[PDB]
Write an enzyme that holds these catalytic residues in place. Structure first.
Site, PDB file in Angstrom:
ATOM      1  N   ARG A  24       1.113  -1.049  -0.001  1.00  0.00           N
ATOM      2  CA  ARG A  24       0.081  -0.289   0.373  1.00  0.00           C
ATOM      3  C   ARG A  24       0.870   1.262  -0.016  1.00  0.00           C
ATOM      4  O   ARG A  24       1.756   0.967   0.354  1.00  0.00           O
ATOM      5  CB  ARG A  24      -1.142  -0.007   1.281  1.00  0.00           C
ATOM      6  CG  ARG A  24      -2.269  -0.424   0.638  1.00  0.00           C
ATOM      7  CD  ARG A  24      -3.563   0.268   2.416  1.00  0.00           C
ATOM      8  NE  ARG A  24      -3.605   1.406   1.857  1.00  0.00           N
ATOM      9  CZ  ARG A  24      -4.259   1.890   2.428  1.00  0.00           C
ATOM     10  NH1 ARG A  24      -4.554   1.776   3.600  1.00  0.00           N
ATOM     11  NH2 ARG A  24      -4.409   3.249   1.664  1.00  0.00           N
ATOM     12  N   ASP A  49      -3.217  -1.200   8.502  1.00  0.00           N
ATOM     13  CA  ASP A  49      -2.480  -0.567   9.469  1.00  0.00           C
ATOM     14  C   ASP A  49      -1.418  -0.829  10.540  1.00  0.00           C
ATOM     15  O   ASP A  49      -2.312  -1.682  11.805  1.00  0.00           O
ATOM     16  CB  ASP A  49      -2.907   0.983   9.438  1.00  0.00           C
ATOM     17  CG  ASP A  49      -2.154   2.555   9.696  1.00  0.00           C
ATOM     18  OD1 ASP A  49      -0.887   2.049   9.564  1.00  0.00           O
ATOM     19  OD2 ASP A  49      -2.314   3.427   9.814  1.00  0.00           O
ATOM     20  N   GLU A 297      -3.727  14.383   5.834  1.00  0.00           N
ATOM     21  CA  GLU A 297      -2.768  14.464   4.182  1.00  0.00           C
ATOM     22  C   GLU A 297      -3.323  15.158   3.478  1.00  0.00           C
ATOM     23  O   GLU A 297      -4.416  15.699   3.139  1.00  0.00           O
ATOM     24  CB  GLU A 297      -2.957  13.255   3.571  1.00  0.00           C
ATOM     25  CG  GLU A 297      -2.831  11.892   4.491  1.00  0.00           C
ATOM     26  CD  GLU A 297      -3.539  10.124   4.433  1.00  0.00           C
ATOM     27  OE1 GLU A 297      -4.212  10.280   3.359  1.00  0.00           O
ATOM     28  OE2 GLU A 297      -2.871   9.354   4.742  1.00  0.00           O
ATOM     29  N   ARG A 313      -6.276  16.883   2.323  1.00  0.00           N
ATOM     30  CA  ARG A 313      -7.858  15.547   2.706  1.00  0.00           C
ATOM     31  C   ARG A 313      -8.060  16.183   3.866  1.00  0.00           C
ATOM     32  O   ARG A 313      -7.795  17.685   5.074  1.00  0.00           O
ATOM     33  CB  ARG A 313      -6.802  14.478   3.113  1.00  0.00           C
ATOM     34  CG  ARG A 313      -7.942  13.312   3.634  1.00  0.00           C
ATOM     35  CD  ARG A 313      -7.358  11.997   3.644  1.00  0.00           C
ATOM     36  NE  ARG A 313      -7.707  10.692   4.710  1.00  0.00           N
ATOM     37  CZ  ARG A 313      -7.534   9.540   4.849  1.00  0.00           C
ATOM     38  NH1 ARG A 313      -6.660   9.523   4.034  1.00  0.00           N
ATOM     39  NH2 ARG A 313      -8.772   8.903   5.334  1.00  0.00           N
TER      40      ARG A 313
END
Ligand SMILES: [Ca+2]
Ligand SMILES: [Ca+2]
Length: 448
Positions: A24, A49, A297, A313
């Site tokens: 990712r 994550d 982000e 974001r």
């Protein structure tokens, strides 16, 4: 149309590459020599994550404009479910040094359970990483030698990768779940560099002591790329997007930057610091207690005069854009909401483009153009000055004149680069955590 280029996707990372089941978080960058560097998270136990994984950083290079790629390498790998996540690439054009930064957690830590502050302590004017024993006693690492709380030298030393040595023999690593001395469980910002065009990389530097404040819980790289300022009073500054949480867990964007070729770093203010919300409420990133104004982000681009634009974001459903007149140290109080660009709460990519388009300076943008992670779209935004601020600086907005669907269906994180031929390379998450796809596009295609 005749002459348009949109290459068929190549799975630049995929299950089994470098023996990683999952991947990712793309980053893509063309070096001054013309090499493409692609970095990514090699997520070894699934796509989850941290802390529910063991994640390493992988890199591939192309010396022929993205036509063929090398066999890859892993450049950071910590043991026992300590992870590095979210890479970003930038270069200092004056020295030819390439930088890669990433967020690092010890085993068992991630965004949600990160401890407050940098993990360093000031002893007589220098910052030293703290270590803790089973009973919670605090030690400091001073030039890789462990000292106890009374400043007596112990039998322990460390290295840059966190290995822990007793009288010169490795016994564990301070990032593991079993070491007798462990770093604080929190986020750390790591930096590595390459002087040979990405073929080999340094061991990580932990720059938390310069960029993470005592009131930040999480501070992480915002993945993708940075910039080096080209114009004006901060020419040469290296700017790297980040985001952090305060003690209440609320997120705000910022940049870290270096004026000395990556030797020292500073974190600027967030656009949430002294931000004026739509109807006049003033907030600050340290005290923000509500979800709605969060900024997370982000990626940064430069205007013709050197002004910076931070694309972020956020939770509004649309792109947010902050403006800095001082090279990323502070931001204007108004964060623009550009209702022409949907933002489904996902990472985005934006880059400067080296040639004008239709008589205007331009940027290239990529994100999922939807209320979900789908409809992956690459845009050309033409910069227009629309007035001036009260301080006399130019005010710039974007005309999203060309908007091209490149990926029907799933589309999440992405990263753009301009290529040597003036075309655009793109590495994107067209699956959640398996194949990461690379394509090249030209402007004839994007404008068609
Ligand atoms: Ca690992
Ligand atoms: Ca401000």
């Amino acid at each position: 149309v005749e002459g348009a280029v949109k290459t068929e996707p190549v799975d630049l990372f995929h299950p089994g590459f470098l023996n990683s089941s999952n991947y990712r978080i793309p980053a893509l960058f063309k070096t001054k020599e013309g090499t493409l560097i692609a970095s990514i998270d090699a997520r070894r136990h699934g796509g989850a994550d941290a802390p529910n994984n063991d994640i390493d950083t992988a890199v591939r290079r192309s010396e022929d404009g993205g036509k063929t790629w090398d066999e890859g390498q892993i450049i950071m790998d910590y043991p026992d479910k300590s992870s590095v996540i979210d890479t970003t690439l930038i270069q200092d054009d004056e020295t030819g040094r390439i930088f890669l930064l990433v967020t690092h957690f010890p085993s068992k830590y991630g965004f949600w359970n990160a401890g407050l502050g940098s993990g360093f302590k000031n002893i007589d004017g220098k910052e030293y990483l703290c270590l803790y024993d089973s009973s919670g006693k605090e030690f400091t690492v001073r030039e890789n030698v462990v000292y106890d709380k009374d400043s007596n030298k112990t039998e322990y030393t460390t290295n840059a990768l966190g290995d822990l040595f007793k009288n010169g023999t490795k016994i564990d690593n301070i990032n593991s779940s079993t070491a007798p001395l462990k770093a604080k469980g929190t986020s750390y910002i790591n930096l590595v560099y390459s002087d040979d065009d990405g073929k080999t990389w340094s061991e990580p530097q932990n720059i938390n002591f310069q960029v993470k404040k005592d009131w930040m819980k999480f501070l992480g790289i915002a993945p993708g790329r940075g910039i080096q300022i080209k114009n004006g009073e901060h020419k040469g500054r290296i700017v790297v997007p980040v985001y952090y949480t305060n003690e209440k867990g609320k997120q705000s964007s910022a940049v870290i930057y270096s004026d000395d070729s990556g030797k020292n770093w500073t974190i600027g203010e967030s656009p949430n610091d002294n931000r004026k919300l739509e109807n006049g409420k003033i907030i600050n990133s340290k005290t923000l207690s509500d979800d709605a104004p969060q900024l997370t982000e982000c990626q940064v681009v430069e205007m013709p005069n050197g002004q910076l634009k931070l694309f972020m974001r956020n939770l509004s459903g649309y792109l947010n854009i902050a403006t800095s007149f001082d090279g990323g140290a502070t931001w204007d109080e108004t964060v623009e909401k550009d209702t022409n660009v949907l933002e489904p709460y996902c990472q985005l990519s934006v880059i400067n483009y080296s040639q004008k388009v239709d008589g205007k300076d331009a940027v290239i943008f990529s994100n999922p153009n939807a209320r979900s992670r789908s409809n992956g779209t690459v845009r050309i935004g033409l910069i227009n000055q629309v007035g001036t601020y009260e301080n006399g600086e130019p005010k710039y907005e974007f005309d999203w004149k060309y908007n091209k669907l490149v990926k029907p269906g799933y589309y999440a994180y992405s990263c753009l680069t301009e290529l040597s031929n003036g075309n655009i390379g793109l590495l994107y998450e067209g699956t959640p955590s398996e194949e990461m796809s690379y394509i090249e596009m030209n402007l004839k295609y994007l404008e068609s």
